[PDB]
């Protein structure tokens with residue numbers, strides 16, 4: 001859990017958008033990822049600091065279906081420690097995962113969510129979404145953007161839940177490639 005701690009210190013930041021509080025994962029250089037619904041647009045507050053967003057790309061699959069992830073490029077001289085080696089090449093399930101949440105209201109929280117399983121299609125508030133996974137844990141509002149981690153891997157970003165189960169967008173390394 002010193003890997004989760006390293007991630008927390010170096011790569012996981014408390015942020016806010018017009019849609020409220022979220023956890024943000026910095027991946028490399030000036031590149032970070034958020035849940036799509038956070039809708040950062042042209043700026044974002046990182047630990048209360050107002051920062052320009054140079055580009056926001058909402059990811060879709062080949063079929064043009066929502067993946068519920070937004071890649072943001074930040075206007076800063078700060079580079080995130082490169083964690084691409086910890087992101088699997090294929091969307092991966094895991095046993096006994098930890099959900100890492102870090103927002104102003106929920107700072108530095110490690111939440112064991114149990115096993116993460118393939119789910120796939122998700123009707124997320126009427127928005128057809130692909131490539132999701134599921135955990136049998138009652139995730140709550142304010143936890144979107146939380147980072148799903150396992151044995152030295154970063155496998156998902158929290159995006160939704162029904163009060164009983166939680167769902168993440170799966171991560172694959174190629175999402176973060178340079179060009």
Ligand SMILES: *[C@@H](CC(=O)OCC)[C@H](C[C@@H]1CCNC1=O)NC(=O)[C@@H](CC(=O)[C@@H](NC(=O)c1cc(C)on1)C(C)C)Cc1ccc(F)cc1
Nearest residue numbers: 037123124125127139140141142143144159160161162163
């Ligand atoms: C995180 C963002 C936030 O807190 O929004 C506050 C309104 C949040 C986490 C969940 C809240 C409840 N438990 C969760 O872990 N995500 C959301 O609220 C999104 C929408 C939902 O999660 C819906 N749940 C489902 O649709 C659903 C379907 C199944 C089989 O299980 N759950 C709501 C009905 C609660 C926010 C969102 C994302 C994308 C969109 F297009 C619209 C809205």
